[PDB]
């Protein structure tokens, strides 16, 4: 796995069904040189509601990233018409070196919340 290292980490949750938002489709984008969200990394959440190991510390460079979470699919495939097309989190990452970004999300059809947890490595 990592030992504990995880630069970019996504956690997704179902506040309607008290449980892990299993199998969501996260598409982490890195905006590059000219306002072009160049595809960075992608995945599907685990049984534990966590995507993991989307990048290495040598790929995670100082830039505006974007975790885009496919919420509509989670809902369509549950039979409710969701409000939100998808849930995004656009954040300038590794400026001050503190590599560990945990983006956790909490869903329901017409509302979502996101929180970041920015923990320093060993400086």
């Amino acid at each position: 796995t990592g030992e504990s290292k995880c630069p970019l980490m996504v956690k997704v949750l179902d506040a309607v069904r008290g449980s892990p938002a299993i199998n969501v489709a996260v598409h982490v984008f890195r905006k590059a040189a000219d306002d072009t969200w160049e595809p960075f990394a992608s995945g599907k959440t685990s049984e534990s509601g966590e995507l993991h190991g989307l990048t290495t510390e040598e790929q995670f460079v100082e830039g505006i990233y974007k975790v885009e979470i496919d919420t509509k699919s989670y809902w369509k495939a549950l039979g409710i018409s969701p409000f939100h097309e998808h849930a995004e989190v656009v954040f300038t990452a590794n400026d001050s070196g503190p590599r560990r970004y945990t983006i956790a999300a909490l869903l329901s059809p017409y509302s979502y919340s996101t929180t970041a947890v920015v923990t320093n490595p060993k400086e």
Binding site: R17, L78, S81, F83, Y110
Partner: protein
């Protein structure tokens, strides 16, 4: 062989719109893949002066965290080449209920006593429906006359979903 291509399918000769108009209690449905109406299903068809058919079904659907909502839909149809095949837009009175552009094929109907309803959602490459739902309507709550009941069993096999139909309890959930 049996000719199960969603092109091979004979549907209603010369469908009078303003005959089909009215309440029809679903009797058997062939489930698609997905959330579908579980039971207690009733349509009500109407065709306003500019000959547009709109319909409204009510029906019990168990939305996944296991709440049995009694879904009120609305369907607004657009006509095709054929008089018995239309394209139907649907949604709920509630924002949260499904929305779509579905198929709505009348296979047959004697407008006074029954109807088979067809909708293929995904075709296959070869032409067989990868995903259909078919409603047998009766126009009387009770069930319906064995003669015409014979007509609609027959059709079902010519449509190839036949052996896949399930009964609908109408037991006043709405």
């Amino acid at each position: 062989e049996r000719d199960c291509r969603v092109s091979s399918f004979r549907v209603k000769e010369n469908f009078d719109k303003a005959r089909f108009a009215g309440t029809w209690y679903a009797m058997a449905k062939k489930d698609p893949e997905g959330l579908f109406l579980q039971d207690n299903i009733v349509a009500e068809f109407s065709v306003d002066e500019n000959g547009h058919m709109s319909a409204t079904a009510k029906g019990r659907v168990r939305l996944l965290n296991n709440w049995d909502v009694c879904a009120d839909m609305v369907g607004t149809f657009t006509d095709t080449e054929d008089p018995a095949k239309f394209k139907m837009k649907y949604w709920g009175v509630a924002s949260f209920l499904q929305k779509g552009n579905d198929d709505h094929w009348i296979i047959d109907t004697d407008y006074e006593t029954f109807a088979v309803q067809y909708s293929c959602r995904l075709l296959n490459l070869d032409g067989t429906c990868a995903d259909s739902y078919s409603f047998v309507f009766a126009r009387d709550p009770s069930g319906f006359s064995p003669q015409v009941q014979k007509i609609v069993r027959q059709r079902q096999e010519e449509l190839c979903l036949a052996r896949q139909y399930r009964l609908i309890p109408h037991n006043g959930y709405c």
